[PDB]
Scaffold this active site. Sequence first.
Site, PDB file in Angstrom:
ATOM      1  N   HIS A  33       0.810  -1.212   0.000  1.00 14.70           N
ATOM      2  CA  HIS A  33       0.000   0.000   0.000  1.00 14.70           C
ATOM      3  C   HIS A  33       0.866   1.296   0.000  1.00 14.70           C
ATOM      4  O   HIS A  33       0.305   2.376  -0.093  1.00 14.70           O
ATOM      5  CB  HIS A  33      -1.082  -0.007   1.099  1.00 14.70           C
ATOM      6  CG  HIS A  33      -0.585   0.194   2.497  1.00 14.70           C
ATOM      7  ND1 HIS A  33      -0.766  -0.773   3.472  1.00 14.70           N
ATOM      8  CD2 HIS A  33       0.028   1.261   3.054  1.00 14.70           C
ATOM      9  CE1 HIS A  33      -0.248  -0.268   4.577  1.00 14.70           C
ATOM     10  NE2 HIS A  33       0.237   0.952   4.376  1.00 14.70           N
ATOM     11  N   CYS A  61       3.450   1.838   9.366  1.00 20.49           N
ATOM     12  CA  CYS A  61       3.389   0.689   8.461  1.00 20.49           C
ATOM     13  C   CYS A  61       4.770   0.244   7.984  1.00 20.49           C
ATOM     14  O   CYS A  61       5.649   1.074   7.762  1.00 20.49           O
ATOM     15  CB  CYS A  61       2.447   0.953   7.294  1.00 20.49           C
ATOM     16  SG  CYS A  61       0.769   1.413   7.804  1.00 20.49           S
ATOM     17  N   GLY A 108       2.179   6.236   9.516  1.00 20.89           N
ATOM     18  CA  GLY A 108       3.617   6.210   9.256  1.00 20.89           C
ATOM     19  C   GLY A 108       4.331   4.993   9.828  1.00 20.89           C
ATOM     20  O   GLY A 108       5.464   4.702   9.438  1.00 20.89           O
TER      21      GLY A 108
HETATM   22  O1  LIG Z   1      -3.067   8.025   3.093  1.00 18.49           O
HETATM   23  C1  LIG Z   1      -1.989   7.498   2.831  1.00 18.49           C
HETATM   24  N1  LIG Z   1      -1.696   6.202   3.094  1.00 18.49           N
HETATM   25  C2  LIG Z   1      -2.358   5.292   3.954  1.00 18.49           C
HETATM   26  C3  LIG Z   1      -3.442   5.653   4.751  1.00 18.49           C
HETATM   27  C4  LIG Z   1      -4.030   4.724   5.591  1.00 18.49           C
HETATM   28  C5  LIG Z   1      -3.549   3.418   5.645  1.00 18.49           C
HETATM   29  N2  LIG Z   1      -4.220   2.445   6.457  1.00 18.49           N
HETATM   30  C6  LIG Z   1      -5.386   1.775   5.893  1.00 18.49           C
HETATM   31  C7  LIG Z   1      -5.114   1.102   4.570  1.00 18.49           C
HETATM   32  C8  LIG Z   1      -4.451  -0.145   4.394  1.00 18.49           C
HETATM   33  C9  LIG Z   1      -4.285  -0.488   3.071  1.00 18.49           C
HETATM   34  S1  LIG Z   1      -4.944   0.714   2.042  1.00 18.49           S
HETATM   35  C10 LIG Z   1      -5.443   1.667   3.371  1.00 18.49           C
HETATM   36  C11 LIG Z   1      -3.846   2.121   7.732  1.00 18.49           C
HETATM   37  O2  LIG Z   1      -4.588   1.527   8.500  1.00 18.49           O
HETATM   38  C12 LIG Z   1      -2.435   2.523   8.164  1.00 18.49           C
HETATM   39  N3  LIG Z   1      -2.304   2.568   9.606  1.00 18.49           N
HETATM   40  N4  LIG Z   1      -1.709   1.552  10.281  1.00 18.49           N
HETATM   41  N5  LIG Z   1      -1.706   1.833  11.552  1.00 18.49           N
HETATM   42  C13 LIG Z   1      -2.304   3.060  11.722  1.00 18.49           C
HETATM   43  C14 LIG Z   1      -2.549   3.818  12.865  1.00 18.49           C
HETATM   44  C15 LIG Z   1      -3.160   5.057  12.723  1.00 18.49           C
HETATM   45  C16 LIG Z   1      -3.528   5.534  11.466  1.00 18.49           C
HETATM   46  C17 LIG Z   1      -3.299   4.780  10.321  1.00 18.49           C
HETATM   47  C18 LIG Z   1      -2.685   3.545  10.475  1.00 18.49           C
HETATM   48  C19 LIG Z   1      -2.465   3.058   4.846  1.00 18.49           C
HETATM   49  C20 LIG Z   1      -1.877   3.987   4.006  1.00 18.49           C
HETATM   50  C21 LIG Z   1      -0.873   8.264   2.166  1.00 18.49           C
HETATM   51  C22 LIG Z   1      -0.018   9.139   3.044  1.00 18.49           C
HETATM   52  C23 LIG Z   1      -0.994   9.765   2.124  1.00 18.49           C
END
Ligand SMILES: O=C(Nc1ccc(N(Cc2ccsc2)C(=O)Cn2nnc3ccccc32)cc1)C1CC1
Lengths: 304, 304
Positions: free
Chosen positions: A41, A145, A143
């Site tokens: 992702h 991930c 961030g």
């Molecule tokens: O928005 C962006 N990316 C971006 C957004 C969300 C996410 N996602 C869901 C997702 C998974 C596959 S697709 C979407 C997450 O759950 C990541 N996550 N993990 N732990 C978290 C703890 C708190 C908040 C977020 C957290 C993964 C990637 C780009 C920077 C602009």
Amino acid sequence: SGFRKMAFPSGKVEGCMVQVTCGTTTLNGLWLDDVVYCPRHVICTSEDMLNPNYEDLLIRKSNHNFLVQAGNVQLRVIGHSMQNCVLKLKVDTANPKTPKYKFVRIQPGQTFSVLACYNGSPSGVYQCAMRPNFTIKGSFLNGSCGSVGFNIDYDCVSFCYMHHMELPTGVHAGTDLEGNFYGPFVDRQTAQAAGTDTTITVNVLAWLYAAVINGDRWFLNRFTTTLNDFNLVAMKYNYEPLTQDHVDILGPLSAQTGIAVLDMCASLKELLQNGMNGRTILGSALLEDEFTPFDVVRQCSGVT
Amino acid sequence: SGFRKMAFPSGKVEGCMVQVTCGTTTLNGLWLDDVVYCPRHVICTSEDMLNPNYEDLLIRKSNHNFLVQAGNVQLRVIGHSMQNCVLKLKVDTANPKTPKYKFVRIQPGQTFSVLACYNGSPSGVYQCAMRPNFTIKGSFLNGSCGSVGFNIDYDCVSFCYMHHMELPTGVHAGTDLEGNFYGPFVDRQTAQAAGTDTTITVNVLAWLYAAVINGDRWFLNRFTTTLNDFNLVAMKYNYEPLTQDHVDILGPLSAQTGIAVLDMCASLKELLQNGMNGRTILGSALLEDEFTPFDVVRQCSGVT
Ligand SMILES: O=C(Nc1ccc(N(Cc2ccsc2)C(=O)Cn2nnc3ccccc32)cc1)C1CC1
Ligand SMILES: O=C(Nc1ccc(N(Cc2ccsc2)C(=O)Cn2nnc3ccccc32)cc1)C1CC1
């Protein structure tokens, strides 16, 4: 004496953390030999997370679009490929700090340490358990991930987890190092509810043996039980059914303390039925289930 | 989201651990620059711990009697001296893995990570707090002496603790890196009882703010209190009296959540008076006091 939620020393893993950026998105990568492993992702934008077609999205990306930085030095990307939910970025330099390592897919109920990272930099280390519903109760912010879970046997690092997402319930989902999600979770911004979170009975029993070894014994009683009798109580309290394999793994703790596994099950049964009555066990007011019988033995013997 | 008892990444400290042997006794040493720091009781035998005269015991020891091994390589000892309860072994080689470091004497209520070691090798890392009675509730077995406690600010390691002893009550005592014991403890095998272990009120409040940030809010109430009213309740429950300095440090958490410090004190007051009623807060059934307001902010922002 004393008992703590102890994590493995993270040094061998810190030396593998890098920062991976693809377009606007930055996350953590794991650099082992000449390959950097990261969640796929990393290629997704805001209008992608909703329903991403990773194969179609990856087609628009070339080796030069993946920016891999280790400390303040840039790694040259000479290959890229997708394996399940991870990207494998081939770099031209083998990581000089690569420890002896393995990729393992852990069983639910097993424990591991997590080295939480942001921008390729470690922020902290804590001990987790893979829940029976294949989620982990971690501590991850945006961030984080690409942060990994692992175990260490003397000098060998067994990587078992890579962080990918946080479910709307605040629990965490991720993959093994081959990119396969633990549980039914998909890397998509959709409502995915975790199943029933049951208590890891074998771990609570192991923790109860740790408590006896360290002096906490108020919960020991004059009773015993059978596997079937105990499991009737375990079912009612959403505890995992105890098997003869579980009894077998508790064997060294049973031998060390002289308390038969079924007698400890009877103590657990009474604690489940009557509660703690305002008392504590190893500084906890609830039954701890994130220590395996192996962890208890390791901590109570001093394995380095 | 999620909240965990997180320790600092231990890599910078692992690279400093060595094994120090003097006669029959082996413990851990900390190698920084060309000096190895270790507990002075490394020179003690069985008939010494009872009432050791460290000055008289050290007279019978020469540079060659202190065996310092880092990994599988032996360090040459060119000097030895006693500073309070630590020995400083001057070696002919500066540690190539010496990080930027400081020696700090922490305040009671402050937290730190411990890298537990045996024979100079790390076994695990966990987060501790210096109790108001100057003991730590660690996890140490025989051979763990010389294991250190520390904090990390970006690249600087502030060493604050060195493990020396376990009191007959199972709690732990130790020194700062200048060899001064925290509290009234002496490095002698005698009955030394710890004082009253009071709860670190400022830390419980910081943890309550962490709980609100991460979604646990059932404990929020319609009440408020004053510092004097709250302190009457804190006294009854052996909680540390809260000062205006404590209120001031809770300021950023109060600003982030929009819950005034005194309103959070009123929630704490009701939790103290009425208990949890079988409920949990951040997966705990008791009030957690081993997270400072700085730790909560750091974990909730992702400082690396
Ligand atoms: O928005 C962006 N990316 C971006 C957004 C969300 C996410 N996602 C869901 C997702 C998974 C596959 S697709 C979407 C997450 O759950 C990541 N996550 N993990 N732990 C978290 C703890 C708190 C908040 C977020 C957290 C993964 C990637 C780009 C920077 C602009
Ligand atoms: O017996 C020897 N040494 C030797 C013995 C005891 C000790 N002492 C007390 C002491 C302190 C200054 S003098 C005596 C400790 O409490 C060390 N400690 N710390 N954590 C422990 C957890 C479990 C058990 C012991 C633990 C220190 C040194 C030589 C090997 C033969």
